[PDB]
Design a protein around this ligand. Sequence first.
Ligand SMILES: [Yb+3]
Ligand SMILES: [Zn+2]
Length: 607
Amino acid sequence: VDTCSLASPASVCRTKHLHLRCSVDFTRRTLTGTAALTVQSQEDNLRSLVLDTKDLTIEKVVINGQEVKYALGERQSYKGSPMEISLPIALSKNQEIVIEISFETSPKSSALQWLTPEQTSGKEHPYLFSQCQAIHCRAILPCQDTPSVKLTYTAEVSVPKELVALMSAIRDGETPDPEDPSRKIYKFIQKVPIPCYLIALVVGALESRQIGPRTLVWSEKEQVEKSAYEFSETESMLKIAEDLGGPYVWGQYDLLVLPPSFPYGGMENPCLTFVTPTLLAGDKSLSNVIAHEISHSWTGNLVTNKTWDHFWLNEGHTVYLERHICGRLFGEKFRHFNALGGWGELQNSVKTFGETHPFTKLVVDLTDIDPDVAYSSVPYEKGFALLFYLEQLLGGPEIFLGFLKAYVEKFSYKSITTDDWKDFLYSYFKDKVDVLNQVDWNAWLYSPGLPPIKPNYDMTLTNACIALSQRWITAKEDDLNSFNATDLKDLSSHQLNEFLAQTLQRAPLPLGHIKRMQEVYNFNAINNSEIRFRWLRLCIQSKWEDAIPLALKMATEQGRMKFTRPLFKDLAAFDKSHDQAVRTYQEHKASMHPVTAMLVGKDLKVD
Ligand SMILES: [Yb+3]
Ligand SMILES: [Zn+2]
């Protein structure tokens, strides 16, 4: 059972389809419309059901052409408010009906960010975007807001006519709105069943450029050219992903580059991956995020976690496929480099939460926990470590890739648990059960902290990073002169990042070391977001006042949580920048993404 949902579960009734008709009102910051849910009863004599909602105003509920009775229960914090609907005729098992709900969202909808013209690139038009994962779809429309239920959908979205709407669906035409000629109606169809967390909507002054046979890039005009180059590897990754996963079933693979306040690196919305503009490094170096989102087209979007306790299924397997894609393009030594980096990120997470913290378990019990608060690298990298350990145990990547493709085929279009996964693993590898039984399943799956065993990693690309980091850590004042720009000459951007990650793990360093590093390496000049993030964290933790404005600016000019939360936390932990960090958060809070605002508040202990 799904302890993040207040809706009727899948064992009671299942939504099969949603037809959404809505209008986007920028003057009121509301979406208004009707959500027609085709619901199939899973039981005899079904006479009511319950849907999830959050800050929704319900006008009416119509079945068979007449209004029916419904009731909103009391709000249950971040879960929202259950909506019980009294059906007018009892349903038999497998009977389907259509329930048409008239609704309006709140301007404070946790699923949405409304941007003024000034917050966009073009400065003339406002912009709206959604982000439903994990449990924010209930803040857009009433639904069984659980990934245990998969549905198809169609939508008609009325927007001002100078703007474009896109969704996680195939575009199915556009027309002037009959009810308001200042407006255009965009239509959409998603014919593959999806969990409702994959429903998404953007409305803005968007333009497109074709970058492959099945891929357009979408952004504001000012970002199209740069985005098209940055993401030019996308077709080549889709082809590799198909090789590993089986056919791509979703038709189009388009990219949307969001405004800077997008809270994640990417979001795998089907047919339309959303990405942060912090990927726009100029050299394609952050394209592992594209590979990740592509991979979700199998792991997550086809095979889906049944509840958010089992989020590692989605993420661990996607990181495992991500790193194969990058390995195929750039070499097996690069795959091992990325893998070992990921372990370092897992070390960081575990150290941050503490080694006995429940959020460091692979499978987590989210009863009474907000999934947004529990969100971290753990499901990604502990999950990835488990799978790379199994790869090693079971005979190598070719063999384990056979299991991954079989797994995807087995559970396509379904929602599953960890036990489902484990059962199939044992079934696939039945000739190697004795090996599988050496795994400490309880510790890997259910214990906090670092995993009980670390995989083997090729070190070839990592060695230079470690060596340089170690030179800086062990340097005394009289050693600082020996550093020079030539130290970096054979390092890729990836290796520079890893050098910084390695060094950050032993921060602070002496202030004079950090000043020297700027003198000889000019890291202040680097706009690669991953590198600049780590460098600024290293500067702030080492108490360099000159970095304060740089860190404040990066924290606020974009909103990717990966970067914004630790930058604010570092700035708050430094006595010299503490009051400014808090003041800056207070000044920016009303114009931040709502989830990011909430989490940065909790981190700073402000409100
Ligand atoms: Yb010395
Ligand atoms: Zn992911």
